[PDB]
Paper text:
S from both SARS-CoV-2 and SARS-CoV-1 uses angiotensin-converting enzyme 2 (ACE2) as the cell surface receptor (Hoffmann et al., 2020, Li, 2015), ACE2 is expressed in a number of tissues, including epithelial cells of the upper and lower respiratory tracts. S consists of two subunits, S1 that mediates receptor binding and S2 responsible for viral and host cell membrane fusion (Walls et al., 2020; Wrapp et al., 2020). The S1 fragment, at the membrane distal tip of S, includes an N-terminal domain (NTD) and receptor binding domain (RBD). Although both regions are immunogenic, the RBD contains the interacting surface for ACE2 binding (Lan et al., 2020).
Thus 5 potent mAbs use IGVH3-53 (bearing 3–10 non-silent mutations). We determined structures for three members of the group, 150, 158, and 269 (the others are 175 and 222) and found that they bind almost identically at the back of the neck with similar footprints of ~800 Å2. The flat binding site of the RBD and the approach angle of the Fabs limit their H3 length (11 residues) and the number of contacts H3 makes with the RBD, which is compensated for by the interactions from H1, H2, and all CDRs of the light chain. We note strong LC interactions with residue N501 of the RBD, which is mutated in recent variants (B.1.1.7, B.1.351, P.1). Thus, H1 and H2 determine the mode of engagement, as seen in previous studies of antibodies with this V-region (Yuan et al., 2020b).
Author numbering:
A (entry chain H): 1 to 117
B (entry chain E): 334 to 519
C (entry chain L): 0 to 109
Write the structure that this text describes.
């Protein structure tokens, strides 16, 4: 019943932009801590951004000023606008719901972002 | 007569940040220079006023708000800040005029097996207006299905405890905060 | 002056039925603010433990967590074939941003 479904990944040149979408069901986006978490191929987990239910947003330093998180209350969706992309931004991007101080109990299958040389 | 600042700072126990305590102060001569010169304050930041040039200033009402938060959360007790505390527990207006005072209280507000006395609000649908105060305990509904008072999946109790253990890092240690909002005039 | 997580060992290979313990260390006391995740390759992480020792629903009982302060352990009492994966700890209620452990990969040999 409950699931998150990422979409929008692809292959992009450096300095190009990309926009990701996370369709929720069984869970209301604007009522939750919704974060984006990425994982570079072969490396560890790196939190990217979060948006509070109240609307506050926060970002990792490595994406500050280049990434923008948003939500669509109408379509129960979470979005990540990724601008000025760099090679170190190549990763699988996951949206997840925080239910306790960072505990991500629900994840999506991810979407693959690749920044060509 | 003197203002009851001893009752504010030297109080035996402070309130939880979600139920922050407010005490009005009026009809009393107040000594402020002693407060600023006191080295017992980790944080003493004033907004809209010089801290030294304070004894020579008259204001109608002076409200003193006190509570307890983490060390790392003290930076949220400031004008135009966002975060768990500023959004859902205690909000200061952009045009705030006053001072924020904080000091480490690990020796008082931390117990060996953790101190679960001090709470904070983790879930709230929308932000607090400046100086708003929410003390409701209704199950936060995170999904479409209503909770009907039964906690569970998508059905979260809104308040969480700090659990102050004396071995926590300073950023996770309890600090006591006092916020002095002034009512300035001409 | 931020808090950092270390995870040991980095890599370990064991056999079916083995009792496996993984350590996560915080650079400063963080009480019980921790979560453990399992990530099989090409799949999204799965929450195993949160608040240092609370087992997530649906997670098999052989997984368990413990520790408080700076030392945290994840324990698989009896390794199963499907248990091969990387394992991440995570600093909960962390400021300014959530911190993840570097991960512990677990392989399975004879
Ligand atoms: C908050 O209290 C301190 C200390 O209070 C002292 O110890 C208490 C147990 C009680 O016995 C009080 O009556 C004591 O004064 C105050 O700092 C003291 O200030 C007085 C003069 O005002 C001085 O003689 C003491 O030496 C000081 N004590 C210390 C330890 O420095 C402080 O003024 C109080 N703050 C407010 C706002 O009232
Ligand atoms: O619907 C639920 O409650 C469970 C929780 C994990 C995924 N599905
Ligand atoms: O305002 C309050 O609730 C604080 C708590 C201890 C006594 N006074
Ligand atoms: O930020 C301000 O306006 C001053 C400087 C630090 C304390 N108050
Ligand atoms: O940030 C901290 O940990 C404390 C409180 C403010 C100044 N030092
Ligand atoms: Cl940004
Ligand atoms: Cl200061």
């Amino acid at each position: 019943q409950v699931q998150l479904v990422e979409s929008g990944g692809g292959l992009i040149q450096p300095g190009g932009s990309l926009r990701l979408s996370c369709a929720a069901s069984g869970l209301t986006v604007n009522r939750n801590y919704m974060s984006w978490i990425r994982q570079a191929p072969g490396k560890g987990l790196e939190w990217v951004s979060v948006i509070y239910s109240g609307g506050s947003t926060f970002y990792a330093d490595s994406v500050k000023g280049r990434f923008t998180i948003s939500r669509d209350n109408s379509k129960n969706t979470l979005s990540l606008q990724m601008n000025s992309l760099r090679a170190e931004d190549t990763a699988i991007y996951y949206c997840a719901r925080d239910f306790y101080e960072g505990s991500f109990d629900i994840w999506g299958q991810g979407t693959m972002v690749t920044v060509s040389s | 007569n003197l203002c009851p600042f001893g009752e504010v700072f030297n109080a035996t126990r402070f309130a939880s940040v979600y139920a922050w305590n407010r005490k009005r102060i009026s009809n009393c001569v107040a000594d402020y220079s002693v407060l600023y010169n006191s080295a017992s304050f980790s944080t003493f930041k004033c907004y809209g006023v010089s801290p030294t040039k304070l004894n020579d200033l008259c204001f109608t009402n002076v409200y003193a708000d006190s509570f307890v938060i983490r060390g790392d959360e003290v930076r949220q007790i400031a004008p135009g800040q966002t975060g768990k505390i500023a959004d859902y527990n205690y909000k200061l207006p952009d045009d705030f005029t006053g001072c924020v005072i904080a000091w480490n209280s690990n020796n008082l507000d931390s117990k060996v097996g953790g101190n679960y006395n001090y709470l904070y609000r983790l879930f709230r649908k929308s932000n607090l207006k400046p100086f708003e105060r929410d003390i409701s305990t209704e199950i936060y509904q995170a999904g479409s299905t209503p909770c009907n008072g039964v906690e569970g999946f998508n059905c979260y109790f809104p308040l969480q405890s700090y659990g102050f253990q004396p071995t926590n890092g300073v950023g996770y240690q309890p600090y006591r905060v006092v916020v002095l909002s002034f009512e300035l005039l001409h | 002056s931020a808090i950092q997580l270390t995870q040991s060992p980095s890599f370990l290979s064991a056999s079916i039925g083995d009792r496996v313990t993984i350590t996560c260390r915080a650079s400063q006391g963080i009480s019980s603010y921790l979560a453990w995740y399992q990530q099989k390759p090409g799949k999204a992480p799965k929450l195993l433990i949160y608040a240092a020792s609370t087992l997530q629903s649906g997670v098999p009982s052989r997984f368990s967590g413990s520790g408080s302060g700076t030392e945290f352990t994840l324990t698989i009492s009896s390794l199963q074939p499907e248990d091969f994966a990387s394992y991440y700890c995570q600093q909960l209620n962390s400021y300014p941003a959530p911190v993840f452990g570097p991960g512990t990969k677990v392989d399975i040999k004879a």
